[PDB]
């Protein structure tokens, strides 16, 4: 097993699946049909966090709004969503709320009707315009690069969420700023060890 | 026929005090008219203070 040298890997994880480093200490994927669903579910999680982590960091580096401040314009009656400074001419709460439900539910239900298991996770066609999946050897290389970047993104999202939990209101980049103030005092040590 | 003397058999008759336990074969009645020919001894008495019972060939399993 690569994920923990000297540890025997589960017998159903042989390293062929992209990102199969033999990690499954609870043996969740011992039921083969669950393993395949879990493969699909992991990629879906990976691709969302890979979109979100830029979305959480890029606007904080730029104009006002850490990923939590970008959401406090709703809730309280009023509604004045601003994209890149300009208040978008439709950024009221019920407008995007319906648009989000209708658009996301439609494309998510469409995803669920695919019967083929390999197209459930690697559909291709329109979503592979540049033909990156044409080469079978190169196809599998990008499969691993996808899952590894996606697991890193999921890991970053957890940090973002857990950091927010510890320093409410702050943003992840402000956390890094506060860290670089004096790294030997502004650490997770304060969180793990109060005062 | 039947298990050998001193065989260690698991009891499979459900209503038996020794069900799923094990005893020792005392004798196997060779008369083919005997419905329950395997005599088995156990080390603990049942509620009637009896320590041995007859079983069928299908009710006994060597272990």
């Amino acid at each position: 097993a690569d994920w923990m040298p000297g540890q025997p890997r589960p017998s159903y994880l042989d390293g062929s699946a992209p990102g199969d480093f033999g990690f499954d200490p609870l043996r969740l994927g011992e039921v083969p049909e669950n393993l395949e669903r879990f493969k699909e579910s992991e990629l879906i999680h990976c691709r969302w966090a890979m979109l979100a982590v830029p979305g959480i960091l890029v606007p904080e580096a730029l104009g006002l709004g850490n990923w939590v401040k970008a959401q406090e314009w709703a809730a309280l009656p009023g509604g004045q969503a601003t994209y890149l400074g300009n208040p978008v001419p439709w950024g009221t709460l019920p407008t995007i709320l319906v648009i989000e439900f209708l658009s996301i539910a439609f494309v998510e239900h469409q995803r669920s009707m695919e019967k083929d298991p390999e197209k459930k996770k690697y559909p291709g066609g329109a979503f592979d315009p540049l033909g990156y999946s044409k080469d079978p050897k190169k196809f599998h290389e990008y499969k691993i690069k996808e899952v590894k970047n996606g697991r890193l993104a999921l890991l970053a999202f957890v940090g973002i969420c857990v950091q927010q939990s510890a320093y409410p209101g702050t943003g992840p980049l402000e956390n890094l700023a506060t860290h670089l103030a004096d790294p030997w005092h502004n650490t997770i040590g304060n969180v793990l060890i109060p005062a | 026929i039947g298990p050998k003397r001193g065989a260690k058999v698991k009891i499979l008759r459900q209503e038996s005090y020794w069900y799923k336990g094990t005893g020792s074969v005392v004798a196997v009645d060779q008369d083919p008219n005997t419905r329950y020919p395997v005599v088995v001894r156990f080390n603990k008495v049942n509620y009637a203070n009896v320590s041995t019972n007859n079983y069928a060939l299908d009710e006994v399993e060597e272990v």
Binding site: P77, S112, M113 | -
Partner: protein, 95 residues
């Protein structure tokens, strides 16, 4: 908020969803777990004469078979979503 606009937009979308986007899935699942059975046999087949499926109502000349029960079902969800939006906007709740 215009009530007629909210109600008829909600019902419109719900009816649209049930006819064009969710129809196959709902039909597939009804076929999957079909009529209720007692001891391996439908209530009607067992003698519950009052349990006869009303094939007359279920008939429809709609291309996909969207019938009057579908209109009642998806039309009900629309009215429920509509009146949730209307009542929720009628108050001045502050979280």
């Amino acid at each position: 908020l215009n009530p007629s606009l909210v109600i008829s937009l909600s019902t419109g979308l719900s009816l649209f969803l049930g006819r064009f986007v969710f129809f196959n899935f709902q039909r597939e699942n009804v076929a999957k777990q079909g009529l209720p059975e007692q001891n391996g046999v439908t209530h009607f087949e067992a003698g519950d004469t009052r349990a006869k499926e009303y094939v007359s109502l279920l008939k429809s000349n709609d291309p996909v078979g969207f019938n009057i029960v579908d209109v009642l079902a998806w039309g009900s969800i629309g009215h429920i979503v509509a009146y949730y939006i209307l009542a929720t906007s009628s108050n001045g709740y502050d979280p």
